[PDB]
Amino acid sequence: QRIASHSHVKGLGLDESGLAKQAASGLVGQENAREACGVIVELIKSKKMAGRAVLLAGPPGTGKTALALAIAQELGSKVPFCPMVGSEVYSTEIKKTEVLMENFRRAIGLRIKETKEVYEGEVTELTPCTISHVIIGLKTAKGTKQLKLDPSIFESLQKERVEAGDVIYIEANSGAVKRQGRCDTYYVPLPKGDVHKKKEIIQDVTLHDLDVANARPQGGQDILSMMGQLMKPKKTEITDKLRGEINKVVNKYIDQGIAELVPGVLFVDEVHMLDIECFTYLHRALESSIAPIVIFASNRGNCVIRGTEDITSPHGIPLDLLDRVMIIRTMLYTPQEMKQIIKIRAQTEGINISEEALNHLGEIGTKTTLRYSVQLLTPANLLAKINGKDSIEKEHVEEISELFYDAKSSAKILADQQ
Amino acid sequence: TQRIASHSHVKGLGLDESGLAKQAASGLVGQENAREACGVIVELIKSKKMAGRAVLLAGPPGTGKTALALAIAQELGSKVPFCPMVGSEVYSTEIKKTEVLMENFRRAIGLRIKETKEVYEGEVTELTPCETENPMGGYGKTISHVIIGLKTAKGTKQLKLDPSIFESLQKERVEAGDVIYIEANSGAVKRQGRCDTYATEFDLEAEEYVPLPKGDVHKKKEIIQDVTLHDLDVANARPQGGQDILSMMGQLMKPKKTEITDKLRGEINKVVNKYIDQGIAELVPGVLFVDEVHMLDIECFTYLHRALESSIAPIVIFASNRGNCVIRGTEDITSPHGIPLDLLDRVMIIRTMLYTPQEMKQIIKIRAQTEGINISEEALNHLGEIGTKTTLRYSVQLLTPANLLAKINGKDSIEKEHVEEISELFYDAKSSAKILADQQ
Amino acid sequence: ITPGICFSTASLVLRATDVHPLQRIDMGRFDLIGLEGRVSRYEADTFLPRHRLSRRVLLEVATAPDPPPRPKPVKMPFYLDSLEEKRKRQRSERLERIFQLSEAHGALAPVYGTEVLDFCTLPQPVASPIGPRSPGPSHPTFWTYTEAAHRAVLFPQQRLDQLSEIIERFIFVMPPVEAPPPSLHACHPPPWLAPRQAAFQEQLASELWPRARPLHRIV
Amino acid sequence: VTRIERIGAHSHIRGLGLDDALEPRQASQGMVGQLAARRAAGVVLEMIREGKIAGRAVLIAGQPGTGKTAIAMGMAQALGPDTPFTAIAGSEIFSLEMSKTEALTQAFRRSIGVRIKEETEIIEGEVVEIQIDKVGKLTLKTTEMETIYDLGTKMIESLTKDKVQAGDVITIDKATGKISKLGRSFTRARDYDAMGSQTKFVQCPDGELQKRKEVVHTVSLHEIDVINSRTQGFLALFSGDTGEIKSEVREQINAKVAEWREEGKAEIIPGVLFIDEVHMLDIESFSFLNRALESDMAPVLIMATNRGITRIRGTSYQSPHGIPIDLLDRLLIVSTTPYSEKDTKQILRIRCEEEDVEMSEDAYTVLTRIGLETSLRYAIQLITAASLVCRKRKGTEVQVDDIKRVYSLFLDESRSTQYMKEYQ
Amino acid sequence: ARAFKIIREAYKKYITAH
Ligand SMILES: Nc1ncnc2c1ncn2[C@@H]1O[C@H](COP(=O)(O)OP(=O)(O)O)[C@@H](O)[C@H]1O
Ligand SMILES: Nc1ncnc2c1ncn2[C@@H]1O[C@H](COP(=O)(O)OP(=O)(O)O)[C@@H](O)[C@H]1O
Ligand SMILES: Nc1ncnc2c1ncn2[C@@H]1O[C@H](COP(=O)(O)OP(=O)(O)O)[C@@H](O)[C@H]1O
List the disulfide bonds (chain E). Predict the structure, then answer.
């Protein structure tokens, strides 16, 4: 639900031989660029390279964001894909370089299967046995079981104020106690499964999530209690100490087979918004052996770099970083391709369009940017709906285009300049 | 021992009793005029009479500005504070620029404070009170003194204290056979732990079974502690202590930390004056050395007007490198040495000269002598010859890599071949600039 | 004082968005930060590798029981065939899980470890005019710090004392309106949510409220 | 199985390819060519390993694609983990929690190693019983032997507040810092249903009850931040505290390290600080480096830059390499020349070996000819791209016609710029 | 340690004898 600008893109739409089709999983046209994206998507699936970088280049509206999203769709949910805007690097809490490194680490994932168990039920009895252990009885709709519990866990029970008739979820490996409520009969339903729940959680994490969880301590009950109360900003992790140690432990678990590394993608939009010190950090950073594949997108040609105030470079990116990057060019659509895109968007968005309405809307797309023809569909359909019709008749597009101006027409109006 | 650095060879200004230089005294060669000048300012420091006086070491890079600036530090010895800072250290995130300047200014004013303390210690063997005649009506048990017997490795002695110590002793909960500490003037009793002669043989206890003290039962010594005024300031700004919940600003580090005149002057200069005029402490006004001063902001340069005009200031050595140059923080104001004319009106300028080939051979020889290199006279002459073409510092720096080539080649000293080889492995600034000018 | 202190209101599920019992992963296998104050270089590098308790040895101590000590002296129907099988089955499960957890709870070593930090950590007032605690004159830093330098740091106690005369007279400003904490937060909340906040406030106000007693005169 | 570190740009450089005489080989352990530059790098590597002199600084200069970063990685792999090698980009000092100067100081100190050796008496064993009346006794066991100890009040207070219990494998040192080691394997079956997250079950020790711990560990001198706060190791896991006082950095930590070195409890092993893309520094940072290099225990600086005569950041002035002349006076400069038709082909061959790609000699010829025209760094990328385009074609060796399949998909800076005739 | 083993042996002999 909730259609969005790219929600028709279901994949790159290559065939089994690589070559792009004229129209496929949402995408239409961009034969050469979709072919190039299809070549790099197997670089991603290979899990073999590190820090490889791609620049999707071309005018605004030529599908470059759409191709990056098509890659993300082509892969699925089993590998990470991190959207960032180059504008996002200007953090006020964190130095730009560290925002950039954090995002480099969001894009490396780690799958890990824990067969784990939790004991839950209505507690029928507690007896501690200086406490050697605690015997606790738990009841569910499938019977009762008597548990022996590690005496350290006996602290948690008293902290949660559990007593017989409560429903609790004592977790086997952590020893963590959560009091889910009072039992229904006295409030939460008596759990309807077995008292000893066991399941293989196969859910995955990322390197950055790990770093963040290791940045700050938890618990302690001493001076640390007050660290549980201050405002909690983010701070930089340490390159040659902590995040490297994280690498060591992750490698230890990969060797044991407990975890599997899934290198993902970092997709940076509006890369021209990065500072020059960001560009140069970036081209010191994607030469590292642990980096993801990084996809850059830029929609402006030869212009001045940020933070230099006079240095001009193609695509707004310094020649240093434009080396060590593979450029995929995207190009402007023909009227036929724009007609097809408008049709695909309409049928995605739930709209019916009469053939003559579609043809003139595409002609609008020739006088004006494609994205604007795509804008007009929903309000035109809304007018048609308010005139009781199902289809967009030409009477509606060729009139809704008078209420709303495009960039060029409104600029011509602004040329009265007072 | 410790590693050899750029200036490890300079051991003083190299001045005889008339305040001249022979030619190469104490690790410095040449610069006789400049070394005489800061020979005068060394004695300006030693006389302790002036405040906020300032001298600017001005000359081309590599002409010994830093070298003789810290040769002054060698002349003064470790007693007086010599506080080095570079012109780039003023820019900070936590604290305003001029506040860094004030911190450094009174980080260069020392205060060495002398105080005898006298102490009694030992295993306490006797602890008996001394009854006396009833001071008033008949209660009995009037304690006039208390006898306490202390043993050390030297001997055993009995000591009489007045009954207040009996109370403190009991409140400290000491027992016969443990080791105490008594501070004669102050009157404290501190229990430093049961005597080790009652050993931890199967006792696991963590409380110190402290060994029987060595030396006399009574011992006194003059403690002599030197603190900078800045240490006193900082210790008053963010103090320690396990109480007063404000002192539990302990998770937090310390930004915002610009110290205040009410404290700085109103509360901390009085105590220093008191200790000085009482006979407890001596002021040791030192030196603040600011090299690359050209890096300071116009706001900093103007603050230095006020700072240098104070009675409570060190003497300040500035070192500068640039020509007539734009002052930082101004819109294209150009002035000598990159320093505003207004501040140049306040500094005596010492000019450092650019070396002759002969002087450079001498410096190269001294640097080889210091780094532990043996060098042939032919290789020394060739280092001099290639150092006349480029900067002295490059000529000097070729020594160690050339010595490594010599050692690899089995030689015990730098033959001319090795300096030739290194001078083609590595470039200087000028050669590299020509490469850059040729290729795009 | 305004009883019109506002209280925010929310849905149950909003206050329960970031909880899940048997779909979340165990992060206890990754937390290096939690070792440093509590685990030793020797423990991880030397003890555990030697005294690693294999599945074997714990299945062994699950054999016949051990006999009692003797420290006093001084001289210087029927049973279900399937029931016993199930008991055997879950005993085996139990022991294999002791192995799994005892291995997993000692799998990674400290970044530094307690003795490294102890070696590096200097006596607490690192660069102050005032010395650290000294056991006595037997050890060097007793004879390096003068008392006259100690009298000049004026710990916050004397700051309060010597200001007390002007604290009594010149502190008079109050905010013209006052309200209880920033808001209350009503809902059909998670049951554990309230006990935990109350316990945390107990844990705070029990420790450093006596430390706020000195500030009471100002407050 | 694929691990954290996989095939990156400099992955093939397993060292600096030099003889014992420091003479570089035509092709050796990963590195190819740059005979002059690699000999110079070997010499500065040797002075790193000697360690005798302080604050030496080398600038690896030259065009993009010569091997400046490659040479730095060669130096870093030739040097063992024993000597701290700190790599940063010049862009990493532009901090918000620190100034440029403090961050640069911290990097300098991160490049100095300190090998702690620590030597402590320890009591270790399984607790058989604890008694408390305040005073009591403690019965400790090792698989060899058993003993009683008598407890004083401080020891008792750190048994009770530690909640030590019978069966706990406990460990106690002189000037006690008692830490619980393990849990007995007899007081077991506790995980019949649960264990505490910190609990372990591995068995009680053997041999004598009293032993000696030797512990050796390299901290960096940046362990200054271990004493900048009340609880302070945390700040080594979150960068945390920012401008720690110079009055404790330069005297207290250095003095105590010298005392450790003289007693024999430590030893400084000075390492390397490699600032890549060093032209990104501001004149403030450069003029700081001026004095920082003069200091008693600086590491050796290595710098890399690809700039010509360019503007120094923070100024309107222009200078060689974009860094000030007063700092170039303090450097030895190693220049790097580009590769010819002979060495380009060879480093492409090395990269194919690293990425495990097999190419026709025709394909090598084509890829070299393409690299010599547009860019060296581009021919390296076509290797993997052609491998992938040939993998879907049901092939086993990259072929001349496949290099062209890639050469039109991923276009260079040259052709990419040349196609900006559209001017959107 | 071997002294502990010897001592325990002697003690066990005594306990068995009484
Ligand atoms: N090849 C394509 N097939 C179908 N729809 C497309 C295609 N390319 C672009 N679109 C649509 O046209 C819009 C153009 O926007 P976008 O591609 O994001 O601009 P840019 O290329 O500057 O990122 C997209 O948002 C998408 O809805
Ligand atoms: N008069 C001198 N005597 C001995 N060595 C000198 C002398 N002048 C300079 N040197 C050497 O040459 C180097 C350059 O001098 P220095 O003062 O550091 O440069 P600057 O004047 O730019 O600060 C010094 O590091 C020192 O080793
Ligand atoms: N001497 C060399 N031996 C092997 N590979 C090299 C060599 N020089 C360069 N390369 C390869 O070419 C790439 C470009 O060199 P690099 O050092 O990154 O450029 P720069 O000199 O601009 O730092 C490297 O990433 C590496 O893969």
Answer: none
Q: What is B355-438's CATH number?
A: 1.10.8.60
Q: Is B212 on the interface with C (CB under 8 A)?
A: no
Residue nearest to atom 7 of ligand 1 (CA): A63
Contacts of A291 in chain D (CB under 8 A): 8
Ligand 2 atom closest to the CA of B63, numbered from 1: 21
How far is the centre of ligand 1, averaged over its atoms, from the C-alpha of A372 (Å)? 11
CATH architecture designation of domain A333-416: Orthogonal Bundle (1.10)
What would the 3-class secondary structure string for chain D be?
CCCCCCECCCCCCCCCCECCCCCECCECCCCECCHHHHHHHHHHHHHHHHCCECCCEEEEEECCCCCHHHHHHHHHHHCCCCCCEEEEEHHHHCCCCCCHHHHHHHHHHHCEEEEEEEEEEEEEEEEEEECCCCCEEEEEEECCEEEEEEECHHHHHHHHCCCCCCCEEEEEECCCCCEEEEECCCCCCHHHCECCCCCCCCCCCCCCCEEEEEEEEEEEHHHHHHHCCCCCHHHHCCCCCCCCCHHHHHHHHHHHHHHHHHHCCCCEEECEEEEECHHHCEHHHHHHHHHHHCCCCCCEEEEEECCCEEECECCCCEEECCCCHHHHCCCEEEEECCCCHHHHHHHHHHHHHHHCCCECHHHHHHHHHHHCCCCHHHHHHHHHHHHHHHHHCCCCCECHHHHHHHHCCCECHHHHHHCCCCCC
CATH of domain B108-235: 2.40.50.360
Closest ligand 3 atom number to CA of residue D73: 17
* Cβ distance of A150 and D413 shorter than 8 Å: no
CATH class belonging to A1-106+214-332 = alpha beta
Is D187 annotated as contributing to ligand binding?
no
Q: Which regions of chain B carry the CATH code 1.10.8.60?
A: 355-438
Statement: B1-107+236-354 belongs to CATH 3.40.50.1100: no
Sheet holding D300-305, edge to edge: D85-89, D272-276, D300-305, D57-62, D332-336
From atom 4 of ligand 3, which residue's Cα is the shortest distance away? D31
Best mutation target among D145, D148, D208 (most E Cβ atoms within 10 Å) is: D145
Burial of B200: CB neighbours in 10 Å, binned 0-12, 13-18, 19+: middle
Q: Does D233 reach chain C within 8 Å, measured CB to CB?
A: yes
Method: cryo-EM
Domain with CATH 2.40.50.360 in chain A: 107-213
Domains detected in chain D: 8-112+220-339 (3.40.50.300), 340-424 (1.10.8.60)
Cβ neighbours of E11 in C, within 8 Å: 73, 75
CA-nearest of A326, A200, A207, A201 to A262 is A207
CB contact under 8 A, B243 and C124: no
Mutate which of B10, B72, B359 for ligand 2? The one with the most ligand atoms within 8 Å of its CB, which is B10
CATH of domain A107-213: 2.40.50.360
